[PDB]
Each structure stands twice: as structure tokens, then as C-alpha cells.
């Protein structure tokens, strides 16, 4: 058999994102989970590259956030990606939950 089905990590990645049999008639509302996974990875990455500069005292929290905003290179990008990707994360999550409770995927097998 194939190497993407034989190797243990590649068999997991295969069975989840390569040849996982999805139903033939799903529309654009089922892509919100992939969008939520991407936006979660976005939040984690920009959060790490902000926490490399954020100091969490009481005398340095807001001053360190506005030090990220003003002095570190492309820090305005990182802070606005975090603070806006959180809002987009929750809006795509609300769409995910509303799709789930509209199309009846709270029902008997899941």
C-alpha cells in the first residue's frame, strides 16, 4: 500500500485531511471549522510573537502594549492581528454554532 497510508503519522494526516470521505453536497457553511482552525493558529502565532515583548506587571502592562505599538518592528500589525482576529474568531465560531444548531448536527449520532 501507499506510504501516506502506511506511515503512522502520515496515516493520521491522510485519514483526517487527505482522503477523509466528506459528504458530496455540503455547501460553504461547512468550511467554518477549517476557518476556525486557521484563525486559532493565527491567534497563537501572533500571541507568541507579542508575548516575546509583553511584560505583565502592573506598572508595565499598558506601557508594554504601547511599546509594542510604537517601537518594535511591525508590532502594530501583530497587535491589530491579535485584537481583530479574536473578534473574527468569535464571529466564525458563532457561525459554526449556528450552522450546527440549524442543520441538526446536535442530533443522535454526534
Amino acid at each position: 500500500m501507499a506510504f501516506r497510508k502506511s506511515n503512522v503519522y502520515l496515516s493520521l494526516v491522510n485519514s483526517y485531511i487527505i482522503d477523509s470521505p466528506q459528504p458530496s453536497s455540503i455547501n460553504y457553511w461547512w468550511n467554518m471549522g477549517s476557518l476556525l482552525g486557521l484563525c486559532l493558529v493565527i491567534q497563537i502565532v501572533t500571541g507568541i510573537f507579542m508575548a516575546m515583548h509583553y511584560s505583565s506587571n502592573i506598572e508595565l502592562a499598558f506601557s508594554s502594549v504601547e511599546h509594542i505599538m510604537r517601537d518594535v518592528h511591525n508590532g502594530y500589525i501583530l497587535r491589530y492581528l491579535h485584537a481583530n482576529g479574536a473578534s473574527f474568531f468569535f464571529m466564525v465560531m458563532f457561525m459554526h454554532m449556528a450552522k450546527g444548531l440549524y442543520y441538526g448536527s446536535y442530533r443522535s449520532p454526534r
Binding site: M1, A2, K5, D19
Partner: protein, 431 residues
């Protein structure tokens, strides 16, 4: 040694093998099951079974003859094999009961019984002959909406509305003299044959068959008649191959012989020189597969046809044999080329020389109809051994690298992944 002479009308082609016994004289027309519309289809098979009927075969058997026929996708043949001292009897029987009046053959008792038996055997072929019907569906979806797409035996829905008017119209439109070739194999000499065709006047018509409006163009398609009652999974995929009288014909047959044919239960076919049999033999991914190379008049196919009892790993078999197909373009060796050269010479020798003088009649009639004269077994062997690895690489880059395929399946084929993965696994990213 395969001599051809054009007479007033017909073309005579013969080969005299003086050690064979049964000399076999027949006429081979150049209008098969791809020279009609899809509504009168099966009239070629109906003509074949009218010629092979009880009346005609009893008349031929009382005199000492044995009838034969073979319908293919551009030529159809009518062969009267016989004893070597008795072929003027063959010639005037084929004159008196096929070329002149056929009113004894075409009245509504013999035609009704023949049509009923043809209907029964065509539906028995459709239900109980599974690899040939998916090769036929492969032909029907590869060249679709275009006259090479037709079933050879004919479909059931376009066979119950056929009467003697259809057969008489087809015999007026396609049983011509600029369309026919009379052949002689076995041990008849050439000049007594044409002496007996020119003594008794034998000419069918004078005109010319109607030329088609649409040439055979490949359309990359897909079809699946999944019947999960069946125990196996017969699929077959094929690309556009080179037709007859093309310069890249023998390299197509050689590239088919590179991958050969296999049978998982015979212990002498499990030990061949194929690299695919080290991938498909540790989980037993298939039962048999055969790489054909069919070459019709306008275009042709190139692919393999398999059967699989392990219906969960179908996509792995497809993926492994398609990576082996990409090995033709990128990194084919020379020992595979020489192994396929010797095996292709063996296969063409087993095809061209055999004991039966009616298969030689059909092959000689076809390749004198399309080409004009028969090339010998020596010139074919020379053209085979004049093939280098770079000619195979150039042909494989021409006709196999990222080309459109057509798939035809049946049985338990949900495990067959659908089309775009199979299409874009014909081209890999260089490993």
C-alpha cells in the same frame, strides 16, 4: 510471401502456407461497428448471425464447409474455411449465397429466429460477461458522441426495432467492391484463387460507402456502473493511443509489453520482470491486469484492464500502476526495453503464425484494407528492434504524461477514489 493483386473491382490478398491443411477463402469488408448511427446499431452482429444461421450453415455443411465471421470496430469478415482441394466450392458458395441474391437468408422466419437468438445472447453478454462489457463501456465513453463509440454487439434498446429493411440498407450502403477485400490463407496458391474469382463473375456492387462527418476524437471521461451484487471490481482506464498506420504504433505496443499482463494465481506469472509486481504482491491488490494497445482506423486506446477481489485497496492499485506509467517518461531503463522487445516479438509471432487459418484471414484482411499491402513478420521484427529507449521516452512524454484518461468500472468500486485524483496522479512532482 503475402501477395496482393487488385482486380477489376475487389482486392485479392493471400498467403500460401503449404504445410497447413485447411485452406480458407473469405471476404473481409471495411465497414465494422463504427460506420453507422447509434439507432440501427447491432446490424453488423445481426448480419453475422444471419450468415451463420441454421439454413446457411446446413447448406455449407452438406458440401463440406465451415462458416466463420468476426465483427470488429472497423472491419467485418465472412470466412468459409474448407479442405485444400475444395475451395472453388467455397468460392461459388460465397458467391451464390452472400454476394448475389440473399432472399433465402432474409425472409421473416430465419430473420425472426436469428433476431431472437441475438437478443438472448446480447442480454446474456450484458449480464454475465463483465470485463468485456467494461472494455466496451470504456470505448463508449472515451470516444463518445462520435462514431467510434458504438458497441460491437449492439445494445438491446436499438436492436428490437430492426427489420429486414435495415439489413438490406446496410448491405446496399456498406457491402461494396471498393470497400471489400477477398482473402486466402492456408494452402491455396495465389493464381488459382484469382483464376477462380475471374472465371465466375463475382462483384457485389459498384459504388462507395458513405464517408463519416465526425472523426474519432478522444474525450477524457468517466463512468461507473457500480453493482455491489458482484464479488469483484472490474475497472479499466485508458488514454488516447496511436492508431494504425501511425509511426508511433510499435512503440505503443512495446510500451504495453513493458508492463505486460499478470495473473495472481498462476505461479509462473508471479515471477515476471515487472516492477509493479513488487508493489502489488504484499497485500494482493489485484487478481489480473492486462495492458492493451488497440489501434483503430482514426484513433485508439492505451491502458490496462483489471479485476480486484480486494475492493478496499482499489485506489492503491490505481496509484501504483499510474506511478509505474510515469516511470515510462522519467526513468525507464534499457533492460525493460529489451525484455519487452523480445516478448513483443514473441507475442506478434504467436498472433501472426498460428494453426487456425481464419485468424490469419481476419488480420490479413484488416491490414490490407487499411494499409494496401501486408508488411511481413521480418519487417515488423526489424521495426521492433530499431526502437531505442529515447523513442519510448519521447512517445511517453507525448501520449502519457498528464494526458486525459477515461475510466470505466463496475462491481464494488466505492473504494475507487473519484476522478480528479486519478487524473492528477498521472503526473507526479518528480519523485
Amino acid at each position: 510471401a503475402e501477395v496482393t493483386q487488385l482486380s477489376n473491382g475487389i482486392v485479392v490478398a493471400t498467403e500460401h502456407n503449404p504445410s497447413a491443411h485447411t485452406a480458407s477463402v473469405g471476404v473481409v469488408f471495411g465497414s465494422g461497428a463504427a460506420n453507422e448511427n447509434p439507432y440501427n446499431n447491432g446490424v453488423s452482429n445481426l448480419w453475422k448471425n444471419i450468415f451463420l444461421s441454421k439454413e446457411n450453415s446446413a447448406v455449407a455443411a452438406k458440401e463440406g464447409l465451415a462458416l466463420s465471421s468476426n465483427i470488429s470496430r472497423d472491419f467485418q469478415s465472412y470466412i468459409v474455411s474448407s479442405l485444400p482441394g475444395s475451395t472453388d466450392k467455397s468460392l461459388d458458395f460465397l458467391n451464390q449465397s452472400f454476394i448475389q441474391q440473399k432472399a433465402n437468408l432474409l425472409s421473416s422466419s430465419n430473420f425472426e429466429a436469428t433476431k431472437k437468438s441475438v437478443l438472448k445472447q446480447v442480454q446474456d453478454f450484458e449480464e454475465n460477461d463483465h470485463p468485456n462489457r467494461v472494455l466496451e463501456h470504456l470505448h463508449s465513453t472515451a470516444f463518445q458522441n462520435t462514431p467510434l463509440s458504438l458497441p460491437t454487439r449492439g445494445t438491446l434498446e436499438s436492436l428490437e426495432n430492426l427489420v429486414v429493411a435495415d439489413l438490406e440498407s446496410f448491405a446496399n450502403n456498406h457491402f461494396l467492391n471498393s470497400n471489400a477485400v477477398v482473402v486466402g490463407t492456408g494452402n491455396i496458391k495465389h493464381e488459382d484463387l484469382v483464376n477462380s474469382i475471374e472465371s465466375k463473375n463475382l462483384s457485389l456492387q459498384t459504388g462507395t460507402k458513405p464517408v463519416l462527418k465526425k472523426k474519432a476524437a478522444f474525450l477524457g471521461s468517466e463512468v461507473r456502473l457500480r453493482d455491489d451484487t458482484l464479488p469483484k471490481a472490474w475497472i479499466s482506464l485508458a488514454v488516447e493511443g496511436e492508431p494504425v498506420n501511425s509511426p508511433n504504433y510499435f512503440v505503443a505496443k512495446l510500451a504495453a509489453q513493458i508492463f505486460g499482463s499478470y495473473n495472481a494465481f498462476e505461479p509462473a506469472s508471479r515471477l515476471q520482470g515487472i516492477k509493479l509486481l513488487d508493489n502489488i504482491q504484499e497485500y494482493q491488490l489485484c487478481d489480473n491486469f492486462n495492458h492493451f494497445s488497440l489501434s483503430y482506423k482514426d484513433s485508439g486506446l492505451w491502458g490496462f484492464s483489471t479485476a480486484t477481489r480486494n475492493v478496499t485497496m482499489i485506489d492503491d492499485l490505481i496509484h501504483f500502476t499510474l506511478k509505474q506509467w510515469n516511470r515510462l517518461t522519467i526513468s525507464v531503463t534499457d533492460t525493460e526495453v529489451e525484455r519487452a522487445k523480445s516478448l513483443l516479438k514473441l507475442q506478434l509471432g504467436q498472433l501472426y503464425e498460428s494453426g487456425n487459418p481464419v485468424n490469419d484471414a481476419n488480420l490479413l484482411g484488416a491490414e490490407v484494407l487499411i494499409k494496401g499491402s501486408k508488411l511481413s513478420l521480418g519487417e515488423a521484427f526489424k521495426k521492433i528492434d530499431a526502437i531505442t529507449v529515447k523513442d519510448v521516452k519521447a512517445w511517453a512524454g507525448k501520449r502519457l504524461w498528464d494526458q486525459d484518461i477515461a475510466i470505466a468500472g463496475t462491481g464494488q468500486i466505492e473504494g475507487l477514489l473519484d476522478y480528479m485524483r486519478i487524473r492528477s496522479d498521472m503526473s507526479m512532482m518528480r519523485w
